[PDB]
Amino acid sequence: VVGGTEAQRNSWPSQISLQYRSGSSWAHTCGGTLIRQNWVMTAAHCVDRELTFRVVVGEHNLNQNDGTEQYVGVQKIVVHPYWNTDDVAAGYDIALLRLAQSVTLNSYVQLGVLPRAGTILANNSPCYITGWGLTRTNGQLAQTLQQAYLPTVDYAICSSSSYWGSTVKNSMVCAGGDGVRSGCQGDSGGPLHCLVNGQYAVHGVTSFVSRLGCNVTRKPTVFTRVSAYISWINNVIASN
Ligand SMILES: *[C@](=O)([C]([N]C(=O)[C]1[C][C][C]N1C(=O)[C]([N]C(=O)C1=[C][C]=C(C([O])=O)[C]=[C]1)[C]([C])[C])[C]([C])[C])C(F)(F)F
Numbered sequence: 001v002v003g004g005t006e007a008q009r010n011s012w013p014s015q016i017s018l019q020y021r022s023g024s025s026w027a028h029t030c031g032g033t034l035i036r037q038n039w040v041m042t043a044a045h046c047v048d049r050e051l052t053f054r055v056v057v058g059e060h061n062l063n064q065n066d067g068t069e070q071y072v073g074v075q076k077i078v079v080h081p082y083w084n085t086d087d088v089a090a091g092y093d094i095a096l097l098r099l100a101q102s103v104t105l106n107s108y109v110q111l112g113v114l115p116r117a118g119t120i121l122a123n124n125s126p127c128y129i130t131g132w133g134l135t136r137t138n139g140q141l142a143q144t145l146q147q148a149y150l151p152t153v154d155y156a157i158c159s160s161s162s163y164w165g166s167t168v169k170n171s172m173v174c175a176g177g178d179g180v181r182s183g184c185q186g187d188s189g190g191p192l193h194c195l196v197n198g199q200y201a202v203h204g205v206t207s208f209v210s211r212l213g214c215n216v217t218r219k220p221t222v223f224t225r226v227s228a229y230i231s232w233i234n235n236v237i238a239s240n
């Protein structure tokens, strides 16, 4: 997250860190959202790779014991069948992970609330991105979970020539674009939390940024629109 602020420990309890094994240690690579005690939602492009993964829930600081972490292996990965490897702009950038064991819920570990199917946010809706991703273009990962206010940019504006043009599909959400705040590498797969009728719900899965950098004016961060995939989510969970 570029332009972020440090999140409180208990603000975004559905956020997870998705890590891969690198020799003897584990490294953060993506975010995700806990959606059942044994299922995580993330981006397809995080998990279509030759790596071994684990999930950490209750995480705050990647490099220090928080006293709240639960570490769980990943037992099954289901990528959207229409995802095409390394083609983010085609969409379908979503995957579900069944965890090897159910996690326990507490003030640091809660399920993300999903929107109702088909829900679309008004332009300029209030949302926050969260993650441990780079804090500057070509920078380094955050140690502590960051948040940034990233209001939505609706489809009619986002798909206009001055923004993302025909790159953006209606199955995506755009947020931000002020040139100061954005997602960045390592935020992929995590939530976009938007305040609707008094409740934060996870409306986006962080997907991609511009070829010109993370924080680029009129190039909002682009997210998979969760509300376009609710039937798919429920079908996968029911079948596995
Ligand atoms: C995420 O944390 C990370 N996402 C990315 O880095 C994604 C994954 C593939 C590459 N990517 C990008 O965001 C890159 N953008 C594109 O590849 C791209 C831009 C525009 C178009 C088009 O058609 O208009 C097509 C592709 C940029 C150049 C890095 C973050 C940024 C959310 C993780 F992948 F884990 F690093």
Ligand SMILES: [Ca+2]
Pocket (backbone or CB within 6 Å): 059, 060, 061, 062, 063, 064, 065, 066, 067, 069
């Ligand atoms: Ca920690």
